[PDB]
Amino acid sequence: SSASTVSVGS
Amino acid sequence: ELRVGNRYRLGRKIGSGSFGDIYLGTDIAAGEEVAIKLECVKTKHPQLHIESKIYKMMQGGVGIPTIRWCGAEGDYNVMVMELLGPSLEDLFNFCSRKFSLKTVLLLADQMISRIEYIHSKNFIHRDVKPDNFLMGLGKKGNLVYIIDFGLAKKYRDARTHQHIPYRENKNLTGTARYASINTHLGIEQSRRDDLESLGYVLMYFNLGSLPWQGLKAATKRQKYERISEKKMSTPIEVLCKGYPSEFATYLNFCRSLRFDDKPDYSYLRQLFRNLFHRQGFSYDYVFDWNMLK
Numbered sequence: 001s002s003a004s005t006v007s008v009g010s
Numbered sequence: 011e012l013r014v015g016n017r018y019r020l021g022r023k024i025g026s027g028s029f030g031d032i033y034l035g036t037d038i039a040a041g042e043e044v045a046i047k048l049e050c051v052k053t054k055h056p057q058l059h060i061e062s063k064i065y066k067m068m069q070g071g072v073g074i075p076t077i078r079w080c081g082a083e084g085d086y087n088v089m090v091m092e093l094l095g096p097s098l099e100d101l102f103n104f105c106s107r108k109f110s111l112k113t114v115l116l117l118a119d120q121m122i123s124r125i126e127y128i129h130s131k132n133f134i135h136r137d138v139k140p141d142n143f144l145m146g147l148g149k150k151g152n153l154v155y156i157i158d159f160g161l162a163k164k165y166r167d168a169r170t171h172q173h174i175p176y177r178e179n180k181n182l183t184g185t186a187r188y189a190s191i192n193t194h195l196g197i198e199q200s201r202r203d204d205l206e207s208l209g210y211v212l213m214y215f216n217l218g219s220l221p222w223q224g225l226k227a228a229t230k231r232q233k234y235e236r237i238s239e240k241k242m243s244t245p246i247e248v249l250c251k252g253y254p255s256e257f258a259t260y261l262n263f264c265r266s267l268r269f270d271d272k273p274d275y276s277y278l279r280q281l282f283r284n285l286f287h288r289q290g291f292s293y294d295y296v297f298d299w300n301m302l303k
C-alpha cells in the first residue's frame with residue numbers, strides 16, 4: 001500500500 | 011526523441027520518483043544506453059542539482075551509479091546516469107516473493123557495503139528499501155547499486171566529522187514499512203537507522219512480508235503510529251523465528267547502537283559470511299533470478 005511504501009519528507 | 015547535452019538522445023520513461031522522471035537514453039557518441047533524469051526547470055523547489063551534487067560526492071564507490079553529465083536543456087534540468095537493471099523489489103516479485111537464503115546473504119553482503127560507503131562519504135541514506143537497490147546490467151549484472159538520494163543528508167561535518175546533534179519530535183521521514191523504531195519515535199536518523207532498515211529489508215526477503223504490513227488506519231499519520239506500535243511490540247526473536255539467528259543478532263546489534271556510534275560494518279558482514287560458509291554456499295553471484303528459465 002502506498003501509505004506504508006511511499007517515502008515521505010524531503 | 012529529443013537531444014540532451016550534445017550527445018544524449020532521450021527515449022521512453024522507465025521510472026518516476028518523488029521529483030522528475032527517469033528515461034531510457036542513448037549516449038550517441040559512445041554507443042551506450044544511459045538513464046536520463048529530467049526535472050522541470052520551472053519547479054519552485056529544484057532538487058535535481060542537489061541530488062547530482064550528492065551522486066558526484068559518491069563517485070568511485072562500487073555500486074554507486076556513474077553520473078555522466080549534468081546540465082539544463084529547454085524546459086528541463088538534466089542528470090545523465092549509468093543505466094541500471096531491475097530493483098530488488100522487481101526481482102523479488104519475479105522470484106514469486108521467495109528468495110533463497112543464499113540470495114538473501116549475497117544481497118546482505120553488498121547492501122551493508124553500499125551503506126558503509128555512503129556513511130564513509132558523511133551521508134545517511136534514510137530511504138533504505140528494496141525499491142532503492144537496483145542490480146547492474148551487463149558486466150555489472152552481479153553488483154547491487156543503491157539509488158534515490160532524495161532523503162539523504164549529512165550526519166557529520168565533512169571537515170571535522172562532528173556528528174549532527176540528537177533531536178526528537180520529528181515527523182517520520184523515509185518509508186514507514188522499513189523505518190527504524192527510533193525514526194517512528196521521532197528521533198533524528200543516524201548511521202544505525204540505515205542499518206536497522208536493512209535488517210527489516212532482509213527479514214522482508216526471508217518472510218515475503220513484515221508483520222506490520224496491512225495495518226488499517228483513517229490517515230497516513232495514524233498508519234505510521236500503528237506500524238510504530240507493531241514494530242515496538244514484535245520481539246526480534248518473534249520477527250526472526252524459523253530463520254538463522256544471524257538475522258536476529260544483526261537487528262539486536264543495530265538496535266543497541268548509540269545515536270553517534272560508528273557501526274561495526276565488518277562484524278555485521280562477517281556475521282552473514284560465517285552463516286554463508288556454514289551453509290556451504292559460494293560467493294559466485296548466482297542469484298535466484300539467474301536461474302529463471
Ligand SMILES: Nc1ncnc2c1ncn2[C@@H]1O[C@H](COP(=O)(O)OP(=O)(O)O)[C@@H](O)[C@H]1O
Binds near residue numbers: 024025028091
Ligand atoms: N540509473 C537508473 N537506471 C535504471 N532505472 C533507474 C535508474 N535510476 C532510477 N531508476 C528507476 O526510476 C525510479 C525513480 O528513481 P528515483 O527515485 O528518482 O532515483 P534517482 O534519483 O536515484 O534516479 C527508480 O525507482 C527506478 O525504478
Ligand code: NA
Binds near residue numbers: 297
Ligand atoms: Na549473477
